[PDB]
Amino acid sequence: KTSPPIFSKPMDSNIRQCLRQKKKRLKKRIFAAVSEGCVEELRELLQDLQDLCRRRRGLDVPDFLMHKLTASDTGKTCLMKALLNINPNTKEIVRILLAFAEENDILDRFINAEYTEEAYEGQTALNIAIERRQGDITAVLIAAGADVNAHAKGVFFNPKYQHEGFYFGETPLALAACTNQPEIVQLLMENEQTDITSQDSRGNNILHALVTVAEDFKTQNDFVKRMYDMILLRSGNWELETMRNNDGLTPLQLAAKMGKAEILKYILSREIKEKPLRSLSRKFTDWAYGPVSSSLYDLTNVDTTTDNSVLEIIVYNTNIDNRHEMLTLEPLHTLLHTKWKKFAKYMFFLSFCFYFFYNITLTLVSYYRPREDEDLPHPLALTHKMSWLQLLGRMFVLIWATCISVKEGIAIFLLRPSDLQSILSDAWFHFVFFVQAVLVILSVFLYLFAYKEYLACLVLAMALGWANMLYYTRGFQSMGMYSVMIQKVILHDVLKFLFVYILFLLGFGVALASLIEKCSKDKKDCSSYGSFSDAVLELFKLTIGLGDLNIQQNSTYPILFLFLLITYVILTFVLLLNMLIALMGETVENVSKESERIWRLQRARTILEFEKMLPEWLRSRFRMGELCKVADEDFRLCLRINEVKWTEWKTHVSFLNED
Template structure:
């Protein structure tokens, strides 16, 4: 067990961690290897039961210790500044993950200065790990605002100084999503760390987002809103004027069935001019559903189910609603062609999902956007927990009334009706479904008392308290939520619209005699 946990550790690693300069110097002078040994034991693994993560190499251990003399001593002894561990992380990657951020920034400066003397084609802060992240991008993903700001300032170029006034060129490489599918903007939106939102206030990220949104993003997004409104309006008209006919004389129905019109067959549905007009709308609805699926499914594969459906900033529930809507529209087409007379149920769900998804476009407005997030959180988290508890309580009622005649108390005839009735009961829409002329098992009375106490008093009031707390939290984060929604919306529109409709922001560095990169100028 010991060898498995501490595999690869050498006395030099230990001396470096303890910052024992004399011992480090003694080991190196005695021929201690500073480049080859790698501490690969489980104790040093990241997110695999390890307790510390200092990389694997002696230089990484020295960098995490932060002692400049030891770092210089190890580099002078032959340690490479570009060594990578099993995750592909360089020394700079490891420093980004350290808790002492100010010390990490100072060490980054020292190591980058040593690396610059090698005249490598790719700078050390542009080296990718196995996940395709540079130290700069890793700082954005982890929400390390101190290191991120430090690296941004190291890349900026001073144009001129006039007393207290200065002009800077900020490098947009890795920040702008124009030519980078894993840009800083994308990583901030997908990050699980709340601290990542604060990066949206850092220059030039804040200015880039403002330019993208005000010049293009909000206009394209609102155009999409208008197109979706026209599309869902056409689908609604197709549902309102769906092909129906009066019931024939030989139509058999029970006494409680009050149906007077039924669905037409496929051959009867497209005869008149009005039918052909409706057919045009149905074709538009079907094509729109296929386009939605064609757009959404590749995004799921690219981002992953957890981030695509789970993250609030990416509008997860609205993607679920949209995919369900599109799938049901395709199912409607199959039912119509195959003469399956079940359109009513599917069409009702389509209308609910289609119009509910229209709330997604409220994200394009600063006043409404945070409230949409509040609704998402209440429905998915607070109300979801409440309904889950209601489900288990209702199972008890179904067991009680399982032996009774279903016609004796109709609200408790089936489990679905019982759940619906109990939901109405707790909402005070109906009174207790109780008939004193019919024998009721005593346990039913006990269950009603327990249900009233738990659901009607405890759970309902707890739900109100939780919803109030959710609203307060969203109100506190209103500005951050609006900015993160703005970035997510910009990225969504950029991915879905052709590149020719977007302009790359900034100025090319060749204009100033610099490398072929794009910069934003600030005074």
């Protein structure tokens, strides 16, 4: 993606880089013989190794012999070098190397060997055989004492990113499962020493590991769905799918964290009909008659009742790709729609009314202020009591403004740094609601010091206040697009047109202000291009189309003053301004193509954020789901959902081929 990785030492190297002595020719000539496939040259070199071991001090002969078979810079052995280079005669050089280590008491050490390298640590001879797809060499090595629980930890086998390495699950069972080799997976699970409930350095197990390697888009061949079904259904218990890693996530919650929509649909809709495996399912269909059916969903680690539920991960954590496609799955779709009809319509309506009456009060009191030198109060709370009836509206300003500044200021403090790179993560409205409430109470405090700059701050509070009414247009679908593409346009288009337009507004502004002469004879001010600040204003009025091409200029070089104004009008009114209108037209077109996807993801935040304001006795009232016994000795919560599907049923009936 970004950059290719660097590795400090290569795993295998048959390319010699640039810059009869038995202590050199024994060790080096075996590696080259076993790599090319010279069988006859190999037996003639092994019998020379035991010749040096007879002229050696006793009781240390296995330690001396392994040093002449293992490398020193890395822990790669003769059997590892043999299996990385597959030849047509590697079935027999395994037999010859296994026979040499059986003649000594070194067979247990020669197979269970590990790399000592910092970058390839823990890799054994089973990892090379399962990688190179040698199915019959694997059965021999298990039958000779290979550890089937060896973990391969390292910088290569556990990277930081999805590139820069190759993560598969760190066990030999997970390597066979992530390489689409179903027969070796059947082979290891039928062995007694295989620990299925095993965990790696990330805390993952085999079901966590298959989620990380799955495709985030639906395609034709999906072997990670058939491997998740195959390994789960053989264990026949609950310990795998209820286990948490170091981040505290199940296999179900890691699919919603990473964004895999096809693995998520499979787990929420499992239904197994055989009697010993009935209890593993999460959906229970009890009656169906034509198109209609009734079903029960599992709802255990899904609904908003514990921490890190799958309804809360999908909504709040943007940068996940498929968030609309997952919120329309079936246990999730009914839960959001039920929370809207039961308490969320009415809390969203009271927020619109307590804010619309806040702005009518703050406007009528600011507009109708006493405009005299002899009458100067601040228009708030009756700080000087003139005793007029219903003064509570002036009290209602300072009460409701200090509530918003406390509440929204906490929400700015709780912002993730990924919440500032999405429009849908509504971090714009947390800023602007805060600064409108600060300026209200700042203007009240500056009258108590009587500075008479309160009116500069009270005017800006009315203009932001009526501009924040654009938040509440997400209640309707039709008006919910205009608050979105007023923000796509002002970031993708206007802040890139701004840097180009200052270069032409600075350059011609200094140039036109340097060609004039001082016209103040007796305070005439004939020249409208006198200063730098006067010339930038008259050039802005000409891109808009409000100024004049006044040629009668009291200055030297009158024909050069015409050449530089007409060049400005062509570049910035005919060419640049009509260009930026054709860049707004491409942004507006793409928001309207996706108007439904954007409106539905803005409700789902407002539904789950009014739920965190409710008290606990009130949230316990609206809990949807009842206790239910779906099999023997197992109790769980459930939703009953009826579903009538006319288009799916009629295609099932027409295609049936009654002939």
